[PDB]
Amino acid sequence: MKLYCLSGHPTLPCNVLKFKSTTIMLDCGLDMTSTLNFLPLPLVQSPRLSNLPGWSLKDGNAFLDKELKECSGHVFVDSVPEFCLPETELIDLSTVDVILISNYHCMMALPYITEHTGFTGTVYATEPTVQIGRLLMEELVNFIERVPKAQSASLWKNKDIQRLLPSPLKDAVEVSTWRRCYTMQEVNSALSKIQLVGYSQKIELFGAVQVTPLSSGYALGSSNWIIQSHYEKVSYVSGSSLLTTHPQPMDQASLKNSDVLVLTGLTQIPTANPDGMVGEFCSNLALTVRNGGNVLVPCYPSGVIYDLLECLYQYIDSAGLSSVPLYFISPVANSSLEFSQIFAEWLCHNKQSKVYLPEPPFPHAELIQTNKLKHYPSIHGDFSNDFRQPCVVFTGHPSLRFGDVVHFMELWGKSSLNTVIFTEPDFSYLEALAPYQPLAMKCIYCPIDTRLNFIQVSKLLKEVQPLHVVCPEQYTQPPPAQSHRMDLMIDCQPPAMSYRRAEVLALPFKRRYEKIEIMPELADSLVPMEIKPGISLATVSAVLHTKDNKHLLQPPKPLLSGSIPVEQFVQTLEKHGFSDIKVEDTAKGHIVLLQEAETLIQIEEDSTHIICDNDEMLRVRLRDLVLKFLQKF
Amino acid sequence: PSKSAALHIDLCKATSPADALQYLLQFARKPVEAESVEGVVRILLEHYYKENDPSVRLKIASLLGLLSKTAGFSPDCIMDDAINILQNEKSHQVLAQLLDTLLAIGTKLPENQAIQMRLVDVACKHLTDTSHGVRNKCLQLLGNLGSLEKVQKIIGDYFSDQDPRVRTAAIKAMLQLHERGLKLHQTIYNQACKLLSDDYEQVRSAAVQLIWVVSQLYPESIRLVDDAFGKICHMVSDGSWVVRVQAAKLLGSMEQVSSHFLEQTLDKTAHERAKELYSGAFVHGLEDEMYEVRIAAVEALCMLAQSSPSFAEKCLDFLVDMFNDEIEEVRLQSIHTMRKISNNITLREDQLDTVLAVLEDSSRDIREALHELLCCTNVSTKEGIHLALVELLKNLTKYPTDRDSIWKCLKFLGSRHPTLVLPLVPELLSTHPFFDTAEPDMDDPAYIAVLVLIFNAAKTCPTMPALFSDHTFRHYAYLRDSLSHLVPALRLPGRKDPSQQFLQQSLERVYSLQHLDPQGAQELLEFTIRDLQRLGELQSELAGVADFSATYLRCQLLLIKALQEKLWNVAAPLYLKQSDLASAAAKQIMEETYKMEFMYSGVENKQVVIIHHMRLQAKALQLIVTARTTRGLDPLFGMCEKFLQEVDFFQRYFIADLPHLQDSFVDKLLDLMPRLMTSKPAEVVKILQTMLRQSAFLHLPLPEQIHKASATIIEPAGESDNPLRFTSGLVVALDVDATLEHVQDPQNTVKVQVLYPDGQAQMIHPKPADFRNPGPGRHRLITQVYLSHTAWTEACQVEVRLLLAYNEGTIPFSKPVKVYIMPKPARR
């Protein structure tokens, strides 16, 4: 069973597994870290972004001052932001049968694969995952659009120049395969190729395999996949979170008893304590608002935002800051809020009960009804009229490379009272903020993560006891941040064989048994017989019918095994009618002579030879006499 | 070279999963060979193919397939691939890549027999796999390899094989066989009869297509097309929703069918109950899960209703009832299908129901569609016309914005059947027998609405002007004067290329008159320029060529006026500016060259070379003036070298048409070029001066019909004194709406420019999606422009303009508009 890893990212995997006569791809991860290398996409051109000085090739042969620009002694490319892709050329994706989705973050890259390659297979995902994915892709398309930055810097992409270019540009990967953002017609085609699935729905593929999504708990609708035939198990776990959260609690029960366990999407900041760091969030926000500045907060309009909003809802009354309003600005803010409200069956038990007691499960509905929190499509329009200060503004894109956050933060950077508070842990906020540096704005880094940490990983591995474990090489090797620490690298027995970007692996498994069904008529017809204690066997004879890779047997050459004792041979010959049979012994066998037809039989260990005259009736009589002194196989 | 280096590097690395993968990814990612070295690269790859870990071999085969698209390879690659496949039977993936490569080779170029499509097909057939290795791919391979117009046996057995995926592969191969004809046999019909009931998805989805395609060929089973149609009918209720789309579309496409059986689809009713009061496949298909299948159903119904002149009357109720579907798309499709089948159809009682819908909230599309339907419907009863009239009047009085369509629908409703309205004439317009009715207001758009009906009806019936009252005659004259596309001419007693030649004449006169004093030349050019502008304004179809030639002559006049300046009569060191108008003349002439080259639509190579020669002329003039003013030998030499480089670039680039450029400035300059290269710039400038003095005037060839681009900013109007207000630092979105006429590649050129008061100009590229194309060469631009700035004490003016870019520089081609902006500072 061959496993292909087509994305070196430790959190946004793309894994093509092969099983029986089927090929299954898991996840379509869009490494949106690569976008960091490009300049921001302003909503309105600002002089400082416009007039940035040009980095120059030291040789000067190439005219790279136009492509590259430098700020704070650093270098950035200058074009429309870009995105890295999974390496699609390892295997023709067109031969891929089924695609599975883990979570809205892991399905971000879906259109590229679903449309361009000619993929004709089906796609599976949970209802909230597909909806919120259609929301995020809409947001991304809108952000990249709305200010088409036509420029296309391509000379820098060359490998030879890339070698000379300074860091981090030296650090780019597969710079060649980068592709511009997709469009809405592709998005619609992708989302229309999808088909839905609920939790624990046992989807059978051609009878060839059986796939099941199980509650993960990371976010609202994230699913850990389980692929099984009747005698195997491959558990693909991507982004679970056993902490106490709003999504449906993680179910480890079915995970145990797994042949192969693919593990992905561990935490990003292992040392981060979610609860204490949310406390730091609230304290810092309160202090800044009391100082009277303005607070900016980048965050995807989903996921962690809702937990953050519950915490803020409970904490605001603690300091009595009712005066300061919360603005939530994004082209999908309203839709995301309503979709979070409707999905009750997927939330935690507490919230499902809050629904059974008629009331909207989340409290941000109560916030909106109270008018403390106001959601707006984008800064242009009504928000401009209804602005206030001081305030707390939830922007759209935490990549800091585009959206409404870039404009707000070019607006507020000059001041020092104002503060930007990072929460989404997916991007190195240092590189994120590099282009805007210098900045008087106080920068606070409190990155909230909820994915399982290494200790819980060890617990789960011991609880499930897998036959094999497969994880990214980043986990196996200790993080570069703390080479000293040992808890920061995964541990298992046998050791988790690792992998890297664009790698091919062969699982240490062999196909031995598979499932086939007998039919009752033949079952009744068959008569078991025993040779050993507790072992009853019977020779079989039938015709197989195969449908949809499912096999069945119905009624329409076995051989011999076992020595024939000469004493019983002669006894049964005499009691059946034979006479004048004389037996002599040899070193290891017996020679028995029957006078009729002059039949001589030599019986040795695992050897019996009969020699008679040209006879047919007596020959067949001897055949049926001797064959019935053993067990037929 | 590159291929050899890659092969050497791969051999040296020899890393199992690392070196091979990296080399393959780099080779595929970077680029194709783009040369005959593809064969050598393929040989090298096949050399290393003898290894382990068939993943590397699969990647190599993928690279070979990608390279095969270059069309360079032919029989060598085919033979090599055949040899490799003959012994590379290992697992399924390797055979998969090999089959894919073979398919690529076969359909890439050869498309021929003689071991170009026959040997490969035979090899694939003989290479039938045991377990899903290639089965589907070899099926599609033989599908794209059409043997001849004589193969179906093998697929016949494969239809009932193990895997539904392979069944789909066989079905698609069959489709590929049909699309090239191949006169499929009849037995496939009976074979696919069971395929219909395959109890798995993705199988029936195309089995339906197969049954349709075979059936439509010839209707002879016992009834064949009727049987297939019955099968499709019994299937229309498939469990899925994906199948039903094909089910509906295919039966719609079908056209010939037994009449008696056709109505059995619609036979079940409250509809017949209503009919008496006044006096199953589709029955279920019309009301289904999601609107896609409803759309497919209505389309199929319209198609086959068109096909069969009968069966329409049976379907009018089934259409009309399905108006309040709640899906605007289904609404529109129902209206459209009713229109498309509106012929020889009667609405004895359906009139009121189909007209009740005319009152929608705005539903501008729906109401317009209803008007379109009415203008093409048919009614038979006088009370029907009266009823339609009264509901139309209610429509007009409630939605006084589409009267412009109400009138046209009434016009057609009259012309279609005039005699029906004649009895209404006394009643509809008040004509109290012995009272002189007070003139109803002439412009009231209900009286005009009811008059246009009568007048359009009056073309046919001669007797009715007798019924016409006193006013109606002068009112008819007024209408026929105002709305000439609604009321035709009647019998009422009360109302019983010199331009182009002249343009050529003037242009050739200017051409001819060149042997005379520059004083006279200036006046001649001025007369003819104002002449041409006048003619361009007068005409509209010549507005392009007229203005084009006008700008050209203006360019020449500017050059002559610059040359005849007083500057040349004073020594070089005495140059003192404030008189050297040539300085601005050069910039103006160059800008005009840009304008003429880019803005106009239809331009030929001859005209382009004329323009580029004139641009070179302007460059020479600029050089001469600059040298006149500057004495520095080094700057002089630099500029002279640049100019000579420009001349050389011109002559190389437009190597052609130089013989046509007789006795031209460029012609004589090039003829005398070498000595100019040898000489010092100080004398080169004087040579250029005299050269221009004695230079001739080229003859510009007039083109075929052309136009000059033109933009008109409609929104924002800009005359609204009310400022747009917003908090400081934030942004306000200004809707920009424009019409661009006669522009090539609008999306890659037009750009919106915003000039703020403080002197800063921001350029905005609109999205490629902002440009709608209602008609020929007349695009609409709709977009948002984002404005922002710190707080202003009072309202200011932000200027919006449309620019045209070229490949460097920009040309305004539109009237700037002003928008009032007011950023107030932040609140509490």
PDB file of N, CA and C in Angstrom, chain A residues 2 18 21-22 43-45 97 145-146 148 174 176 204-206 379-381 383-390 407-408 411 504 546-550, chain B residues 21 25 29 55 93 132 160-165 167 200 725-733 762-763 765-767 784 786-788 826-828:
ATOM      1  N   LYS A   2       0.777   2.025  -1.068  1.00  0.00           N
ATOM      2  CA  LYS A   2       1.670   3.148  -1.295  1.00  0.00           C
ATOM      3  C   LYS A   2       1.025   4.446  -0.831  1.00  0.00           C
ATOM      4  N   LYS A  18      -3.008   4.651  -1.534  1.00  0.00           N
ATOM      5  CA  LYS A  18      -3.476   3.618  -2.444  1.00  0.00           C
ATOM      6  C   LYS A  18      -3.892   2.411  -1.622  1.00  0.00           C
ATOM      7  N   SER A  21      -7.929  -1.827  -4.938  1.00  0.00           N
ATOM      8  CA  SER A  21      -7.924  -1.334  -6.306  1.00  0.00           C
ATOM      9  C   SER A  21      -8.432   0.099  -6.403  1.00  0.00           C
ATOM     10  N   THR A  22      -8.158   0.924  -5.397  1.00  0.00           N
ATOM     11  CA  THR A  22      -8.670   2.284  -5.338  1.00  0.00           C
ATOM     12  C   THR A  22      -7.569   3.236  -4.900  1.00  0.00           C
ATOM     13  N   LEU A  43      -5.900  48.927   0.031  1.00  0.00           N
ATOM     14  CA  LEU A  43      -7.211  49.292  -0.492  1.00  0.00           C
ATOM     15  C   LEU A  43      -7.163  50.644  -1.184  1.00  0.00           C
ATOM     16  N   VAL A  44      -6.386  51.574  -0.644  1.00  0.00           N
ATOM     17  CA  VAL A  44      -6.088  52.838  -1.299  1.00  0.00           C
ATOM     18  C   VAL A  44      -4.589  53.058  -1.216  1.00  0.00           C
ATOM     19  N   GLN A  45      -3.957  53.265  -2.368  1.00  0.00           N
ATOM     20  CA  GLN A  45      -2.507  53.376  -2.413  1.00  0.00           C
ATOM     21  C   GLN A  45      -2.022  54.398  -1.395  1.00  0.00           C
ATOM     22  N   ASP A  97      -9.378   8.490  -7.303  1.00  0.00           N
ATOM     23  CA  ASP A  97     -10.784   8.111  -7.315  1.00  0.00           C
ATOM     24  C   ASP A  97     -11.627   9.047  -6.456  1.00  0.00           C
ATOM     25  N   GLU A 145      -9.195  40.077  -5.551  1.00  0.00           N
ATOM     26  CA  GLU A 145      -9.854  40.972  -6.483  1.00  0.00           C
ATOM     27  C   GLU A 145     -10.026  42.334  -5.817  1.00  0.00           C
ATOM     28  N   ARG A 146     -10.827  43.200  -6.437  1.00  0.00           N
ATOM     29  CA  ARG A 146     -11.213  44.479  -5.850  1.00  0.00           C
ATOM     30  C   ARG A 146     -10.109  45.524  -5.924  1.00  0.00           C
ATOM     31  N   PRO A 148      -7.108  44.954  -8.682  1.00  0.00           N
ATOM     32  CA  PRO A 148      -6.269  44.029  -9.449  1.00  0.00           C
ATOM     33  C   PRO A 148      -4.888  44.627  -9.654  1.00  0.00           C
ATOM     34  N   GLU A 174       9.826  25.284  -4.262  1.00  0.00           N
ATOM     35  CA  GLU A 174       9.063  25.079  -5.490  1.00  0.00           C
ATOM     36  C   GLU A 174       8.553  26.409  -6.031  1.00  0.00           C
ATOM     37  N   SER A 176       8.863  27.612  -8.689  1.00  0.00           N
ATOM     38  CA  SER A 176       8.399  27.504 -10.068  1.00  0.00           C
ATOM     39  C   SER A 176       6.896  27.277 -10.154  1.00  0.00           C
ATOM     40  N   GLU A 204     -19.655   3.401   1.405  1.00  0.00           N
ATOM     41  CA  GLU A 204     -18.958   2.305   0.755  1.00  0.00           C
ATOM     42  C   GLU A 204     -18.579   2.702  -0.663  1.00  0.00           C
ATOM     43  N   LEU A 205     -17.334   2.423  -1.028  1.00  0.00           N
ATOM     44  CA  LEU A 205     -16.827   2.692  -2.365  1.00  0.00           C
ATOM     45  C   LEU A 205     -16.685   1.356  -3.077  1.00  0.00           C
ATOM     46  N   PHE A 206     -17.588   1.124  -4.034  1.00  0.00           N
ATOM     47  CA  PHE A 206     -17.573  -0.023  -4.932  1.00  0.00           C
ATOM     48  C   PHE A 206     -17.513  -1.340  -4.181  1.00  0.00           C
ATOM     49  N   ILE A 379     -15.157  48.233   5.076  1.00  0.00           N
ATOM     50  CA  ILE A 379     -14.973  49.541   5.693  1.00  0.00           C
ATOM     51  C   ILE A 379     -15.668  50.626   4.885  1.00  0.00           C
ATOM     52  N   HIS A 380     -15.715  50.485   3.566  1.00  0.00           N
ATOM     53  CA  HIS A 380     -16.404  51.481   2.760  1.00  0.00           C
ATOM     54  C   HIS A 380     -17.906  51.322   2.920  1.00  0.00           C
ATOM     55  N   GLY A 381     -18.605  52.443   3.040  1.00  0.00           N
ATOM     56  CA  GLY A 381     -20.043  52.402   3.192  1.00  0.00           C
ATOM     57  C   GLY A 381     -20.515  52.799   4.575  1.00  0.00           C
ATOM     58  N   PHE A 383     -20.077  51.574   7.583  1.00  0.00           N
ATOM     59  CA  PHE A 383     -19.119  51.576   8.681  1.00  0.00           C
ATOM     60  C   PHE A 383     -18.443  52.928   8.814  1.00  0.00           C
ATOM     61  N   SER A 384     -18.105  53.552   7.688  1.00  0.00           N
ATOM     62  CA  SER A 384     -17.437  54.844   7.746  1.00  0.00           C
ATOM     63  C   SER A 384     -18.303  55.866   8.464  1.00  0.00           C
ATOM     64  N   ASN A 385     -19.601  55.880   8.168  1.00  0.00           N
ATOM     65  CA  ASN A 385     -20.497  56.784   8.873  1.00  0.00           C
ATOM     66  C   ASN A 385     -20.596  56.439  10.352  1.00  0.00           C
ATOM     67  N   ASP A 386     -20.659  55.151  10.688  1.00  0.00           N
ATOM     68  CA  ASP A 386     -20.957  54.727  12.050  1.00  0.00           C
ATOM     69  C   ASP A 386     -19.704  54.354  12.839  1.00  0.00           C
ATOM     70  N   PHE A 387     -18.544  54.854  12.432  1.00  0.00           N
ATOM     71  CA  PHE A 387     -17.315  54.592  13.164  1.00  0.00           C
ATOM     72  C   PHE A 387     -17.332  55.273  14.529  1.00  0.00           C
ATOM     73  N   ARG A 388     -16.423  54.840  15.402  1.00  0.00           N
ATOM     74  CA  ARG A 388     -16.226  55.458  16.706  1.00  0.00           C
ATOM     75  C   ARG A 388     -14.810  55.185  17.181  1.00  0.00           C
ATOM     76  N   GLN A 389     -14.398  55.917  18.215  1.00  0.00           N
ATOM     77  CA  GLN A 389     -13.163  55.625  18.913  1.00  0.00           C
ATOM     78  C   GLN A 389     -13.414  55.846  20.400  1.00  0.00           C
ATOM     79  N   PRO A 390     -12.723  55.118  21.287  1.00  0.00           N
ATOM     80  CA  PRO A 390     -11.837  54.000  20.964  1.00  0.00           C
ATOM     81  C   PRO A 390     -12.662  52.802  20.544  1.00  0.00           C
ATOM     82  N   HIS A 407      -5.196  48.172   5.479  1.00  0.00           N
ATOM     83  CA  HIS A 407      -5.558  49.580   5.495  1.00  0.00           C
ATOM     84  C   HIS A 407      -5.641  50.106   6.918  1.00  0.00           C
ATOM     85  N   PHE A 408      -6.332  49.387   7.804  1.00  0.00           N
ATOM     86  CA  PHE A 408      -6.429  49.871   9.175  1.00  0.00           C
ATOM     87  C   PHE A 408      -5.054  50.067   9.781  1.00  0.00           C
ATOM     88  N   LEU A 411      -3.179  52.887   8.680  1.00  0.00           N
ATOM     89  CA  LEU A 411      -3.791  54.070   9.273  1.00  0.00           C
ATOM     90  C   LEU A 411      -3.305  54.291  10.698  1.00  0.00           C
ATOM     91  N   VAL A 504       7.489   9.325  -1.474  1.00  0.00           N
ATOM     92  CA  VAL A 504       6.752   8.090  -1.709  1.00  0.00           C
ATOM     93  C   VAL A 504       7.156   7.081  -0.646  1.00  0.00           C
ATOM     94  N   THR A 546     -19.171 -12.778  -8.607  1.00  0.00           N
ATOM     95  CA  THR A 546     -18.575 -11.535  -8.133  1.00  0.00           C
ATOM     96  C   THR A 546     -19.381 -10.367  -8.679  1.00  0.00           C
ATOM     97  N   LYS A 547     -19.810  -9.480  -7.787  1.00  0.00           N
ATOM     98  CA  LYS A 547     -20.507  -8.258  -8.161  1.00  0.00           C
ATOM     99  C   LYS A 547     -19.971  -7.114  -7.313  1.00  0.00           C
ATOM    100  N   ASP A 548     -19.672  -5.989  -7.958  1.00  0.00           N
ATOM    101  CA  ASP A 548     -19.221  -4.787  -7.263  1.00  0.00           C
ATOM    102  C   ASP A 548     -18.107  -5.123  -6.276  1.00  0.00           C
ATOM    103  N   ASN A 549     -17.117  -5.857  -6.764  1.00  0.00           N
ATOM    104  CA  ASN A 549     -16.006  -6.353  -5.962  1.00  0.00           C
ATOM    105  C   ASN A 549     -16.465  -7.193  -4.780  1.00  0.00           C
ATOM    106  N   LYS A 550     -17.710  -7.661  -4.785  1.00  0.00           N
ATOM    107  CA  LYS A 550     -18.233  -8.517  -3.731  1.00  0.00           C
ATOM    108  C   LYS A 550     -18.396  -9.923  -4.284  1.00  0.00           C
TER     109      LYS A 550
ATOM    110  N   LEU B  21      13.227  11.591  -8.006  1.00  0.00           N
ATOM    111  CA  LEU B  21      12.073  12.461  -7.826  1.00  0.00           C
ATOM    112  C   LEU B  21      12.440  13.914  -8.083  1.00  0.00           C
ATOM    113  N   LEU B  25      10.911  16.153 -11.137  1.00  0.00           N
ATOM    114  CA  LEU B  25      10.160  17.362 -10.832  1.00  0.00           C
ATOM    115  C   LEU B  25      10.792  18.592 -11.464  1.00  0.00           C
ATOM    116  N   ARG B  29       8.942  20.600 -14.304  1.00  0.00           N
ATOM    117  CA  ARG B  29       8.540  21.928 -13.855  1.00  0.00           C
ATOM    118  C   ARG B  29       9.141  23.030 -14.719  1.00  0.00           C
ATOM    119  N   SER B  55       8.077   3.675  -9.092  1.00  0.00           N
ATOM    120  CA  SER B  55       7.614   5.055  -9.017  1.00  0.00           C
ATOM    121  C   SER B  55       8.433   5.958  -9.930  1.00  0.00           C
ATOM    122  N   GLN B  93       0.514   0.294 -11.703  1.00  0.00           N
ATOM    123  CA  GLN B  93       0.842   1.698 -11.941  1.00  0.00           C
ATOM    124  C   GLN B  93       1.729   1.863 -13.171  1.00  0.00           C
ATOM    125  N   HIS B 132      -8.119  -4.512 -12.911  1.00  0.00           N
ATOM    126  CA  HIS B 132      -8.238  -3.058 -12.903  1.00  0.00           C
ATOM    127  C   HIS B 132      -6.922  -2.344 -13.189  1.00  0.00           C
ATOM    128  N   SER B 160     -20.632  -6.342 -19.204  1.00  0.00           N
ATOM    129  CA  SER B 160     -21.072  -7.079 -18.026  1.00  0.00           C
ATOM    130  C   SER B 160     -19.887  -7.594 -17.217  1.00  0.00           C
ATOM    131  N   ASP B 161     -18.819  -6.809 -17.150  1.00  0.00           N
ATOM    132  CA  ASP B 161     -17.621  -7.214 -16.435  1.00  0.00           C
ATOM    133  C   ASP B 161     -17.759  -6.853 -14.957  1.00  0.00           C
ATOM    134  N   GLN B 162     -16.645  -6.907 -14.229  1.00  0.00           N
ATOM    135  CA  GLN B 162     -16.688  -6.856 -12.769  1.00  0.00           C
ATOM    136  C   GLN B 162     -16.996  -5.457 -12.241  1.00  0.00           C
ATOM    137  N   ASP B 163     -16.146  -4.485 -12.560  1.00  0.00           N
ATOM    138  CA  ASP B 163     -16.152  -3.232 -11.810  1.00  0.00           C
ATOM    139  C   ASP B 163     -17.023  -2.181 -12.496  1.00  0.00           C
ATOM    140  N   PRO B 164     -17.889  -1.487 -11.752  1.00  0.00           N
ATOM    141  CA  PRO B 164     -18.657  -0.396 -12.365  1.00  0.00           C
ATOM    142  C   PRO B 164     -17.780   0.676 -12.980  1.00  0.00           C
ATOM    143  N   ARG B 165     -16.598   0.931 -12.419  1.00  0.00           N
ATOM    144  CA  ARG B 165     -15.692   1.881 -13.053  1.00  0.00           C
ATOM    145  C   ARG B 165     -15.347   1.433 -14.462  1.00  0.00           C
ATOM    146  N   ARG B 167     -17.173  -0.476 -16.269  1.00  0.00           N
ATOM    147  CA  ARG B 167     -18.385  -0.294 -17.062  1.00  0.00           C
ATOM    148  C   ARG B 167     -18.484   1.133 -17.589  1.00  0.00           C
ATOM    149  N   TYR B 200     -26.273   0.882  -9.640  1.00  0.00           N
ATOM    150  CA  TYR B 200     -25.139   1.646  -9.142  1.00  0.00           C
ATOM    151  C   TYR B 200     -25.073   2.961  -9.898  1.00  0.00           C
ATOM    152  N   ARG B 725     -19.646  62.285   2.296  1.00  0.00           N
ATOM    153  CA  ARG B 725     -19.017  62.504   3.586  1.00  0.00           C
ATOM    154  C   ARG B 725     -18.503  61.192   4.150  1.00  0.00           C
ATOM    155  N   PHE B 726     -17.376  61.262   4.848  1.00  0.00           N
ATOM    156  CA  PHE B 726     -16.917  60.059   5.532  1.00  0.00           C
ATOM    157  C   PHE B 726     -15.862  60.415   6.563  1.00  0.00           C
ATOM    158  N   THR B 727     -15.686  59.526   7.533  1.00  0.00           N
ATOM    159  CA  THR B 727     -14.727  59.775   8.594  1.00  0.00           C
ATOM    160  C   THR B 727     -13.312  59.780   8.038  1.00  0.00           C
ATOM    161  N   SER B 728     -12.451  60.558   8.683  1.00  0.00           N
ATOM    162  CA  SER B 728     -11.081  60.688   8.217  1.00  0.00           C
ATOM    163  C   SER B 728     -10.377  59.341   8.234  1.00  0.00           C
ATOM    164  N   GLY B 729      -9.504  59.142   7.256  1.00  0.00           N
ATOM    165  CA  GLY B 729      -8.687  57.948   7.202  1.00  0.00           C
ATOM    166  C   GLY B 729      -9.347  56.768   6.521  1.00  0.00           C
ATOM    167  N   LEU B 730     -10.664  56.666   6.617  1.00  0.00           N
ATOM    168  CA  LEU B 730     -11.378  55.561   6.001  1.00  0.00           C
ATOM    169  C   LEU B 730     -11.574  55.857   4.518  1.00  0.00           C
ATOM    170  N   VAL B 731     -12.398  55.058   3.848  1.00  0.00           N
ATOM    171  CA  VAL B 731     -12.520  55.095   2.399  1.00  0.00           C
ATOM    172  C   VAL B 731     -13.985  55.230   2.024  1.00  0.00           C
ATOM    173  N   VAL B 732     -14.230  55.847   0.877  1.00  0.00           N
ATOM    174  CA  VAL B 732     -15.556  55.944   0.286  1.00  0.00           C
ATOM    175  C   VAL B 732     -15.490  55.401  -1.131  1.00  0.00           C
ATOM    176  N   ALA B 733     -16.513  54.653  -1.519  1.00  0.00           N
ATOM    177  CA  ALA B 733     -16.540  54.001  -2.819  1.00  0.00           C
ATOM    178  C   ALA B 733     -17.404  54.815  -3.767  1.00  0.00           C
ATOM    179  N   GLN B 762      -3.709  59.127  -8.647  1.00  0.00           N
ATOM    180  CA  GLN B 762      -3.720  57.695  -8.401  1.00  0.00           C
ATOM    181  C   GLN B 762      -4.302  56.993  -9.617  1.00  0.00           C
ATOM    182  N   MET B 763      -3.634  55.937 -10.062  1.00  0.00           N
ATOM    183  CA  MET B 763      -4.070  55.157 -11.208  1.00  0.00           C
ATOM    184  C   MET B 763      -4.741  53.891 -10.699  1.00  0.00           C
ATOM    185  N   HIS B 765      -6.453  50.236 -12.009  1.00  0.00           N
ATOM    186  CA  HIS B 765      -6.781  49.309 -13.083  1.00  0.00           C
ATOM    187  C   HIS B 765      -8.096  48.603 -12.776  1.00  0.00           C
ATOM    188  N   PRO B 766      -9.127  48.716 -13.605  1.00  0.00           N
ATOM    189  CA  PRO B 766     -10.355  47.964 -13.348  1.00  0.00           C
ATOM    190  C   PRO B 766     -10.186  46.491 -13.671  1.00  0.00           C
ATOM    191  N   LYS B 767     -11.022  45.680 -13.033  1.00  0.00           N
ATOM    192  CA  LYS B 767     -10.907  44.238 -13.184  1.00  0.00           C
ATOM    193  C   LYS B 767     -11.305  43.824 -14.596  1.00  0.00           C
ATOM    194  N   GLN B 784     -16.023  50.272  -8.995  1.00  0.00           N
ATOM    195  CA  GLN B 784     -15.925  51.119  -7.817  1.00  0.00           C
ATOM    196  C   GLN B 784     -14.532  51.726  -7.786  1.00  0.00           C
ATOM    197  N   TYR B 786     -11.999  53.751  -5.091  1.00  0.00           N
ATOM    198  CA  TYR B 786     -11.884  53.915  -3.649  1.00  0.00           C
ATOM    199  C   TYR B 786     -11.108  55.188  -3.352  1.00  0.00           C
ATOM    200  N   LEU B 787     -11.763  56.127  -2.681  1.00  0.00           N
ATOM    201  CA  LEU B 787     -11.186  57.410  -2.332  1.00  0.00           C
ATOM    202  C   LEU B 787     -10.946  57.441  -0.833  1.00  0.00           C
ATOM    203  N   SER B 788      -9.935  58.192  -0.408  1.00  0.00           N
ATOM    204  CA  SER B 788      -9.670  58.343   1.015  1.00  0.00           C
ATOM    205  C   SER B 788      -8.613  59.410   1.210  1.00  0.00           C
ATOM    206  N   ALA B 826     -12.537  61.993  13.135  1.00  0.00           N
ATOM    207  CA  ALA B 826     -13.205  60.925  13.866  1.00  0.00           C
ATOM    208  C   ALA B 826     -14.061  61.485  14.995  1.00  0.00           C
ATOM    209  N   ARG B 827     -15.098  60.734  15.351  1.00  0.00           N
ATOM    210  CA  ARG B 827     -16.045  61.128  16.383  1.00  0.00           C
ATOM    211  C   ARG B 827     -15.695  60.457  17.701  1.00  0.00           C
ATOM    212  N   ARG B 828     -16.612  60.558  18.658  1.00  0.00           N
ATOM    213  CA  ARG B 828     -16.579  59.733  19.858  1.00  0.00           C
ATOM    214  C   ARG B 828     -17.774  58.790  19.842  1.00  0.00           C
TER     215      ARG B 828
END
